Amino acid sequence: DFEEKMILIRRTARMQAGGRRFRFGALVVVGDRQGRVGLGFGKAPEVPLAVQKAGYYARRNMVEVPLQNGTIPHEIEVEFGASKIVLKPAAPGTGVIAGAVPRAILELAGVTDILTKELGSRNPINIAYATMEALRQLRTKADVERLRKG
RNA sequence: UGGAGAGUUUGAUCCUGGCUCAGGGUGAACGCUGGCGGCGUGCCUAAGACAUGCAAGUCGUGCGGGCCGCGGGGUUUUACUCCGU
Ligand SMILES: [Mg+2]
Ligand SMILES: [Mg+2]
Ligand SMILES: [Mg+2]
């Protein structure tokens, strides 16, 4: 009973003596809407196994989202490859203002109000992976004070 | 209190990168259609050319006259038309 949202399906092809030969890739986000999210990229010879595997790997790659009344502790910009995600907390009533990929990811984390920009390469995958890296790097006031003591 | 991206180069991929679109806006124009009202607003081109009317006057308590309507009788009155407004 994580929710699950199917972010990307694509069909890749490779080559053989007299033939194109296909494979599918599914990007699936999985999450409770209460600070936990997962991203997984699954491949298979048919679509539903890809979606299935994606689901599997996502539940197996999850993250501490430190929410705070439906927004995020602080700004972050993550670059992943040539893709870039910028993330900005927002007060309530703002909505989750984002591209389809990072929207999915943030909604299921339980983000209600946030502001975003996809910069750089928009490739849905590297954007997904970077959104995740962004949230993986969020820290709370408490996380920070803990790091600096005496 | 503030920020969404998508399509298209490949057998397929990543990147680069252009083209393209969704939005808002306007002294608008054109097409189909059109019931009311309020407030705004309407030659963006030929600073081309313009019929016609009107758009800058006012003071008689600055001044002297012409003309007229009266009042008041000059020859009684119209011909010499005298004072007052
Ligand atoms: Mg680009
Ligand atoms: Mg080429
Ligand atoms: Mg008509």
Swiss-Prot record:
UniProt GO MF annotations: rRNA binding; structural constituent of ribosome
Source superkingdom: Bacteria
Gene3D superfamilies assigned to the protein according to its UniProt record, in alphabetical order: 3.30.160.20, 3.30.230.10
GO cellular component annotations of the record: small ribosomal subunit
Range of residues in the leader sequence: none
Record keywords: Ribonucleoprotein, Ribosomal protein, RNA-binding, rRNA-binding
Keyword field contains Transmembrane helix: no
A Pfam family: Ribosomal_S5_C
Annotated S5 DRBM domain residues: 2-65
InterPro entries: Ribosomal_Su5_D2-typ_SF (IPR020568), Ribosomal_uS5 (IPR000851), Ribosomal_uS5_bac-type (IPR005712), Ribosomal_uS5_C (IPR005324), Ribosomal_uS5_N (IPR013810), Ribosomal_uS5_N_CS (IPR018192), Ribsml_uS5_D2-typ_fold_subgr (IPR014721)
Residues spanning the membrane: none
Alphabetical GO biological process terms: translation
Record comment regarding domains: The N-terminal domain interacts with the head of the 30S subunit; the C-terminal domain interacts with the body and contacts protein S4. The interaction surface between S4 and S5 is involved in control of translational fidelity.
Misc note: Is positioned such that it could physically interact with spectinomycin.
General function of this protein: With S4 and S12 plays an important role in translational accuracy. Located at the back of the 30S subunit body where it stabilizes the conformation of the head with respect to the body. Binds mRNA in the 70S ribosome, positioning it for translation.
Subunit (UniProt): Part of the 30S ribosomal subunit. Contacts proteins S4 and S8.
Family note: Belongs to the universal ribosomal protein uS5 family.
Protein's name in the database: Small ribosomal subunit protein uS5
Source organism per UniProt: Thermus thermophilus (strain ATCC 27634 / DSM 579 / HB8)
